[PDB]
Design a protein around this ligand. Structure first.
Ligand SMILES: *[C@@H]1O[C@H](CO)[C@@H](O[C@@H]2O[C@H](CO)[C@@H](O[C@@H]3O[C@H](CO[C@H]4O[C@H](CO)[C@@H](O)[C@H](O)[C@@H]4O)[C@@H](O)[C@H](O[C@H]4O[C@H](CO)[C@@H](O)[C@H](O)[C@@H]4O)[C@@H]3O)[C@H](O)[C@H]2NC(C)=O)[C@H](O)[C@H]1NC(C)=O
Ligand SMILES: *[C@@H]1O[C@H](CO)[C@@H](O[C@@H]2O[C@H](CO)[C@@H](O[C@@H]3O[C@H](CO[C@H]4O[C@H](CO)[C@@H](O)[C@H](O)[C@@H]4O)[C@@H](O)[C@H](O[C@H]4O[C@H](CO)[C@@H](O)[C@H](O)[C@@H]4O)[C@@H]3O)[C@H](O)[C@H]2NC(C)=O)[C@H](O)[C@H]1NC(C)=O
Ligand SMILES: *[C@@H]1O[C@H](CO)[C@@H](O[C@@H]2O[C@H](CO)[C@@H](O[C@@H]3O[C@H](CO[C@H]4O[C@H](CO)[C@@H](O)[C@H](O)[C@@H]4O)[C@@H](O)[C@H](O[C@H]4O[C@H](CO)[C@@H](O)[C@H](O)[C@@H]4O)[C@@H]3O)[C@H](O)[C@H]2NC(C)=O)[C@H](O)[C@H]1NC(C)=O
Ligand SMILES: *[C@@H]1O[C@H](CO)[C@@H](O[C@@H]2O[C@H](CO)[C@@H](O[C@@H]3O[C@H](CO[C@H]4O[C@H](CO)[C@@H](O)[C@H](O)[C@@H]4O)[C@@H](O)[C@H](O[C@H]4O[C@H](CO)[C@@H](O)[C@H](O)[C@@H]4O)[C@@H]3O)[C@H](O)[C@H]2NC(C)=O)[C@H](O)[C@H]1NC(C)=O
Ligand SMILES: *[C@@H]1O[C@H](CO)[C@@H](O[C@@H]2O[C@H](CO)[C@@H](O[C@@H]3O[C@H](CO)[C@@H](O)[C@H](O)[C@@H]3O)[C@H](O)[C@H]2NC(C)=O)[C@H](O)[C@H]1NC(C)=O
Ligand SMILES: *[C@@H]1O[C@H](CO)[C@@H](O[C@@H]2O[C@H](CO)[C@@H](O[C@@H]3O[C@H](CO)[C@@H](O)[C@H](O)[C@@H]3O)[C@H](O)[C@H]2NC(C)=O)[C@H](O)[C@H]1NC(C)=O
Ligand code: I5B
Ligand code: I5B
Ligand code: NAG
Ligand code: NAG
Ligand code: NAG
Ligand code: NAG
Ligand code: NAG
Ligand code: NAG
Ligand code: NAG
Ligand code: NAG
Ligand code: NAG
Ligand code: NAG
Ligand code: NAG
Ligand code: NAG
Lengths: 734, 740
């Protein structure tokens, strides 16, 4: 009962069917009637008729996005499915809203289509709609929205008409609306009557109307003569429940304070890509936002201006509930303590985003003066030594990595002019626990005194630099250091009998993660790496081939507590038997992928009784041992994809085996002896040049007898020979 | 008489046989006896015997470098039979000792990158005619065993290079004829007066890499324990009166004794990079001893962990009257004021100032007007804000600024700085700049014809790797004399839907000759016609011509009436429309449509281009070639069609096309060349035909083509070892010329 072409799985007391990206030309009739969620996205389906979803009465969600990669859907093709609640029809080239849609629809998405008319024949009958996404359609000179087409939808909570030539706000909208998205809708004027009966609205998006074109991923055209969006003085007078307001890219050169007169619950205000340098210095509207938590005034700079200081209005002190302030792209030369005086008394202000400001000098003592700062983002400055469902205007990704941020106070000084750690670099700073010094052309010879002013740093990112850590005292001032990242570090001052010297590692009593990736380590001097606390070591992108010379045979034996070792991208052709035996016995994960391994001694796995994962992908291995069970009794996952294995040898802990992208021609009956209690739950085999003759017949019987072994991508398990079966899956054989 | 495997060529009344990189396992005996220079480098030769160069009496030069390429067994006296051998190169051969029985007629001998640990008299002393001796990279053994007086017999030696060898001490008893002594990275920590006693004719002394300051060395680097410097005696250079070149780079020098240059009045080049001379640059007692010095290099002499406000240049820098170039890279300082460079302002010949990689935050650009003859101002890798064993491994030898830029006049390199926008005071108080480099500055300036007004005589402008906006028709129009504009890899930052790209600014130039709009990602344009009467070269590579030509941009380049070179490569072009191709300038002499996805090319359209001499169509998917090319073009001299899918050559392709001298048909799908296409009875002047990388058929089909090669010896076919036939199995791998 192995399903094809859908990889079905149980989810929240209901079986679902993942059938996406399988090159299907039409709706498959081999889908179980018990499924509730069918996903057929990224396929070549061209027609949707009444017989497409025949007998699937329990279908509550259908995803038919990107079909074909136009779509001919007949009238009333989905009406027969009485339980259909969520229907996604994105990127289908539909010229109109499909007719005969079932009234049970609570979620309908018709994004990236050719829908130019919003008719009552396809919308008004859907009285149970809660979410309606009609983005990217007339992006027709204007979208034809029928008068009162949404009035019948008394249950609508979200209406997204973004990226459409609207020009005017649609009249007669349902009072139940809570989220109104109208971004890039060409609406140059907002009146009081546009949001008359929307007293329960909690979100209003009016961004991209009269935009300031700055690195837009979509077409951008200004309002002729630098015109701003004309919002009426009483346009938001009846929006008492408004929490989110997006006025990004609206060429605003003045903010009327009366807009927030009856808006006391406003939590997020977006004002990026405007011309509010003057409004930041005066700020009349700032005294009207006592419950605002996120204020974003990014990329509001004056073109061709590089002022000495940032002019922050005193009225910024009236934003008592503020938690995050994003001031990217303001462009200024110096940040003094006096400049950020209106922000120092805000109790909840934990995030200050000053990225891409080209600040040459910062008085870092002003950060001590803040009451609850947790994130200080200063990336892309000049500090010197000593997808339609996306937010396209706001920096939504975490400014600093959540793993770094979890340790405590975070400071990001990456992409700055810190070419060496100065003696006064970290003086007068708060108790920093997370620090980013990435991409700074830093060639500091770490001698054990550089980070003394911030000694409680636990997560230190020193990637993309030219640092020298040959000294044993390097970074020892950070006693509580737990994660050190030296990814892509290029040694700038190599000594013949010194570089690379990793003696500083054994000084740390709590360092758990160390990333020495892409360091170009081809020489070592002690020659071993000792540490009683180190758990994870990333030695990828180095030269282990050169090291493994009989002096570096026990290079990692000192790391007694090491559980994860990544030896990928090391140009390893053959790991010596003595060198492999000197690896820590405590290892649970070993990644020796993307190398040039021609042979691998499986016999050596007997000295690793805790090894649960062995990654050997992207190699040139040809032979597999016939007695693996004798060497390992704990190996749960074995990845061997993109190798040259052309034969599987004959003959309980192994649950996952990856044999995809290999040279396997067939699987014989002798290797299918599963009379033993082997708990195999996953077996990948896609990309093998199989023989669809009577040789694969014995393997086909094993697949039907052992249904618990999951074989993914059944459409990609293709047999190359013979010509009659070239291209077809191995499961569609006589 | 077509030679194989050597591509022989005549040069100055003597033949020279190029036989390098041909995968030869042994010395070929099919080399003409008339040749004088044989080059068999980069091959798999394993043995050199007396029969290797048999009958080649006229051989004056033999190059056997890199043999084999992943040792070399040379018998004793294997080269003695060649009485005229003057130059012998034996580099990277894993020779354990200097070969014995070498001919006495050797004037040049190179044994670099070998395992030679002993310099014996049995292999060197007999060569009394040696002028150049290169023995670099050998004991790089605890020390090189140099026999006492092994070089004394070599009375004609002018150059001795013992660099990259564990020497520890300067070899005693050196020939008085020596003029160039190279001893770089030789582990010599002490120099005495007796080391250069009888070397009064020495013009070059290299002592670099002895007690080094390890900074980005491409070879092993180890300091002298406890930061020790090279100990040069007070009278070590007392008898070197003819010294012109002195290399003391990477010698950990923290003090320069002025007495070293007491009897050295001809010193022209002094190298002092990678030392600790910050204090010596501020005091400089030795500076008053160099009146004829032209090149002084004090680069990467910085104090680690120090970022001083100013550069301390001694007043004694005014005593370097003959100075032409000063290289002060890696000093590390925050500000350059006019007063700081006061000792250099009165030097008449000072034309080059190298201040690269200094992290200077502010420069008073006015100071450059006080200089009498500044031609090159290199300031790359600073912080200015808006408003191979045969190599010199320590000195920046490449031209700081591209010669084509520098040729215009005063050059200023401000690349890799922090000029994120052109400030209003950016170029004020500068001299009359003709060459300006502003590459890679994250520059998002909206060009409006008012930015370069302070230096309006800029002729070569480099604005590469920036995010500039030149949509205004007035962009760069204040630079009236602009001749070369480089806008490569420019990523627009403020795209307006129906405005970008607006290239109407090009029309306002009366002297612009070269324009490079490569990798600009131009997929939409605004009239949509580019006009110019002076433009000669246009590089439109790395753009989206496929989108533009698929009906508003059909005559995109017709306005460029004087255009001679057009590079339309890397534009993802599958099919150039017939109307779009006909609208190309008729004045075109070179047309490069390479590295595209062209499936078809209309050869008929070449009739409207009577001056087209070069057609580049490499890296394409073309299958068909017209059988009447002579009817369409009468001037096409070079036709490049390599890396295409052409599987058949039509009959009469070579006929009636007398202008064609070069045809590249390599890396194609040609199986064979028939007799019908070899009709060369016409006066066709074909001088070069490339065919390497074709899956040829070594059967009787290729026999008729073989006869054409022997009859027409004037047609040069390069890489004969790479013209390999894939079929049949018996001839798979072998060249087509080694057939029955
Ligand atoms: C102008 O400003 C407003 C206000 O900030 C922006 O509005 C936001 O827009 C984004 C993008 O459309 C919204 O993000 C989406 O939210 C959905 C709902 O999230 C809530 O509910 C789920 C449970 O259903 C919770 O898990 C979640 O934490 C929230 O509580 C999500 O379902 C969406 O997820 C999908 O997209 C993302 C991103 O591609 C994927 O990673 C997911 O896997 C998934 O496919 C998505 O996160 C956001 O909710 C809106 N804000 C509010 C308050 O509703 C405007 O977008 C902005 N305009 C412009 C042009 O920038
Ligand atoms: C230098 O080397 C270090 C050490 O290897 C690297 O740091 C690690 O980077 C990886 C990403 O490559 C991090 O792993 C990821 O962590 C995410 C967050 O984990 C928390 O949240 C999830 C829930 O979302 C919890 O389950 C989890 O327990 C944590 O609390 C995960 O979301 C990621 O999972 C996704 O990707 C993986 C595959 O990468 C899938 O298997 C998952 O199913 C899922 O799709 C992922 O686990 C890791 O946490 C980092 N370690 C540390 C200590 O920070 C550096 O990135 C590396 N530097 C460079 C430049 O290469
Ligand atoms: C310490 O400082 C000294 C002084 O500056 C350096 O000495 C120079 O070293 C370089 C590298 O070995 C020398 O360069 C070579 O010069 C040969 C002679 O050049 C003259 O003669 C030819 C004609 O025969 C002229 O064309 C030329 O302009 C000169 O007048 C060349 O034949 C060499 O060419 C070969 O190598 C180059 C570079 O790889 C290739 O491009 C060529 O095709 C060719 O294969 C080469 O140019 C230089 O001459 C030395 N100076 C002097 C005055 O002799 C030391 O090298 C330096 N030490 C360190 C370690 O940096
Ligand atoms: C943007 O676009 C411009 C215009 O195309 C580029 O600038 C040109 O770059 C080319 C290189 O691609 C330059 O061409 C080279 O010039 C060298 C110097 O030429 C002078 O000196 C030689 C003698 O050495 C004379 O014969 C000649 O007449 C000149 O007086 C030549 O030495 C080069 O020749 C070598 O390479 C070519 C192949 O490239 C071989 O055919 C030769 O045999 C030889 O091996 C070459 O001709 C050209 O001069 C530049 N022009 C200008 C105006 O600067 C930019 O580089 C490009 N920008 C970017 C970022 O790509
Ligand atoms: C320390 O600072 C550096 C530099 O700011 C951080 O690197 C940046 O990390 C982010 C998130 O991983 C990268 O963003 C992603 O980039 C890709 C590629 O362009 C893009 O497709 C994604 O949409 C996303 O924007 C960013 O590229 C990367 N920057 C660089 C220059 O590599 C680093 O993560 C910081 N470390 C910590 C501990 O926070
Ligand atoms: C204007 O300034 C830029 C930046 O300094 C110049 O670009 C640089 O040009 C040099 C010489 O062509 C490049 O050097 C070579 O780089 C390769 C690759 O790393 C290296 O293998 C060679 O040994 C050599 O060093 C250099 O990379 C390049 N820099 C960048 C960032 O692209 C440009 O040439 C200047 N233009 C003029 C008109 O002088
Ligand atoms: C916000 O104003 C800018 C921002 C930028 C950027 C930028 O966005 N960067 C982020 C990505 N990074 C890799 C490079 C730096 N680059 N040049 C700029 C220039 C300006 C600017 C333009 C005109 N007047 C004043 C300032
Ligand atoms: C000359 O002294 C340096 C030079 C450098 C460089 C550098 O050489 N660069 C050229 C290549 N470029 C791509 C990046 C910048 N990077 N960091 C440095 C740091 C220092 C320095 C170290 C210690 N005390 C003072 C100064
Ligand atoms: C739908 O699911 C229910 C159980 O939730 C079951 O009783 C019913 O028979 C199913 N119908 C179909 C057509 O699968
Ligand atoms: C600050 O945040 C807390 C929740 O963490 C919230 O209860 C409090 O009211 C906020 N402060 C102000 C002044 O609103
Ligand atoms: C904090 O800033 C105030 C001014 O805003 C200043 O008076 C005070 O001295 C600063 N805090 C400390 C600890 O110096
Ligand atoms: C390590 O740094 C300390 C402090 O600067 C220094 O005393 C010591 O000599 C350095 N170690 C080495 C091997 O140079
Ligand atoms: C090994 O590392 C883990 C995680 O850091 C730690 O909990 C454990 O105590 C360590 N064991 C030893 C013996 O160091
Ligand atoms: C595997 O390792 C064992 C123990 O070192 C050794 O006896 C055996 O010969 C090795 N096998 C191979 C193929 O190297
Ligand atoms: C060497 O060249 C001369 C002419 O320069 C010629 O007379 C002589 O015969 C040639 N010898 C050989 C062996 O080719
Ligand atoms: C300056 O250079 C010229 C050659 O261009 C030379 O003749 C003159 O002597 C040099 N000046 C001095 C003061 O040596
Ligand atoms: C040149 O510099 C001197 C000081 O060194 C100054 O007095 C003079 O005015 C400067 N020249 C010009 C043209 O201003
Ligand atoms: C173009 O440049 C001219 C001259 O400076 C200026 O007057 C004009 O306003 C600029 N165009 C735009 C669109 O700003
Ligand atoms: C064409 O360009 C060349 C080189 O710039 C110039 O000499 C010639 O006069 C130009 N001809 C015309 C008609 O502009
Ligand atoms: C080539 O161009 C001529 C003139 O436009 C046209 O008649 C002919 O059909 C074209 N050939 C092809 C193959 O397009």
């Amino acid at each position: 009962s192995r399903s094809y072409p859908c990889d079905e799985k149980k989810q929240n007391d209901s079986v679902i069917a993942e059938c996406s990206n399988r090159r299907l030309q039409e709706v498959p009739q081999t889908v179980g009637k018990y499924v509730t969620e069918l996903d057929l996205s990224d396929n070549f389906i061209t027609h949707i008729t009444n017989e497409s979803f025949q007998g699937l009465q329990n279908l509550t969600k259908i995803n038919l996005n990107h079909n074909p990669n136009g779509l001919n859907i007949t009238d009333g093709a989905f009406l027969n499915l009485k339980n259909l609640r969520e229907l996604l029809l994105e990127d289908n080239q539909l010229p109109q809203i499909p007719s005969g849609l079932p009234e049970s629809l609570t979620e309908l998405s018709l994004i990236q289509n050719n829908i130019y008319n919003i008719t009552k024949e396809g919308i008004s009958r859907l009285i149970n709609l809660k979410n309606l996404y009609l983005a990217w359609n007339c992006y027709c000179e204007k979208t034809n929205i029928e008068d009162g087409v949404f009035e019948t939808l008394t249950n609508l909570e979200l209406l997204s008409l973004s990226f459409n030539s609207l020009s005017h706000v649609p009249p007669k909208l349902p009072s139940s609306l809570r989220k109104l998205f109208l971004s890039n809708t060409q609406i140059k004027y907002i009146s009081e009557e546009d949001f008359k009966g929307l007293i329960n609205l909690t979100l209003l998006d009016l961004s991209g109307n009269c935009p300031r074109c700055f690195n837009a991923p979509f077409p951008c055209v200004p309002c002729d003569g630098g015109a701003s969006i004309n919002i009426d003085r009483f346009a938001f007078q009846n929006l008492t429940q408004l929490r989110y307001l997006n006025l990004s890219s609206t060429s605003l050169r003045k903010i009327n304070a009366a807009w927030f007169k009856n808006m006391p619950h406003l939590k997020v205000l977006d004002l990026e890509f405007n011309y509010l340098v003057g409004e930041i210095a005066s700020g009349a509207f700032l005294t009207m936002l006592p419950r605002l938590e996120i204020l974003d005034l990014s990329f509001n700079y004056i073109k061709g201006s590089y002022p000495q200081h940032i002019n922050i209005s005193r009225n910024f002190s009236k934003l008592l509930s503020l938690r995050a302030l994003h001031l990217r792209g303001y462009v200024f030369q110096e940040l003094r303590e006096d400049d950020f005086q209106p922000l120092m008394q805000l109790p909840n202000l934990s995030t200050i985003n000053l990225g891409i400001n080209f600040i040459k000098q910062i008085d870092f003592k002003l950060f001590q003066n803040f009451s609850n700062l947790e994130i200080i983002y200063l990336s892309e400055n000049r500090i010197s030594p000593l997808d339609p469902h996306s937010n396209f205007y706001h920096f939504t990704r975490p400014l600093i990595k959540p793993q770094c941020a979890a340790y405590g106070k975070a400071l990001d000084l990456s992409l700055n002019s810190i070419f060496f750690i100065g003696p006064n670099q970290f003086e007068n700073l708060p108790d920093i626990a997370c620090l980013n010094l990435s991409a700074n052309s830093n060639a500091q010879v770490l001698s054990g005194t550089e980070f003394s002013a911030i000694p409680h740093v636990k997560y230190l990112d020193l990637t993309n630099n030219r640092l020298d850590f040959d000294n044993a005292s390097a970074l020892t001032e950070l006693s509580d250091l737990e994660v050190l990242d030296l990814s892509y570090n290029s040694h700038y001052f190599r000594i013949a009998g010194v570089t690379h010297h990793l003696e500083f590692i054994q000084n740390f009593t709590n360092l758990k993660v160390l990333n020495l990736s892409h360091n170009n380590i081809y020489t070592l001097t002690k020659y071993n790496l000792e540490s009683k606390s180190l758990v994870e070591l990333v030695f990828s992108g180095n030269r282990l081939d050169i090291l493994w010379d009989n002096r570096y045979i026990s290079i990692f034996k000192g790391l007694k507590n090491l559980t994860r070792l990544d030896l990928s991208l090391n140009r390893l052709k053959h790991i010596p038997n003595e060198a492999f035996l000197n690896l820590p016995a405590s290892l649970t994960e070993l990644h020796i992928n993307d190398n040039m391994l021609k042979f691998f001694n499986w016999t050596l796995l007997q000295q690793f009784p805790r090894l649960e994962l062995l990654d050997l992908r992207g190699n040139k291995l040809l032979f597999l041992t016939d007695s693996l069970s004798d060497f390992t009794s704990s190996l749960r996952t074995l990845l061997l994809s993109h190798n040259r294995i052309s034969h599987l040898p004959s003959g309980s802990s192994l649950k996952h085996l990856d044999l995809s992208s290999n040279l396997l021609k067939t699987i014989n009956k002798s290797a299918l002896e599963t009379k033993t209690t082997t708990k195999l739950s996953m077996l990948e085999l896609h990309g093998n040049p199989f023989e669809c003759t009577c040789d694969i017949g014995d393997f086909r019987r094993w697949m039907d007898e052992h249904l618990n072994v999951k074989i993914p991508r059944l459409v990609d398990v293709i047999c190359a020979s013979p010509g009659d079966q070239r291209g077809k899956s191995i499961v569609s054989l006589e």
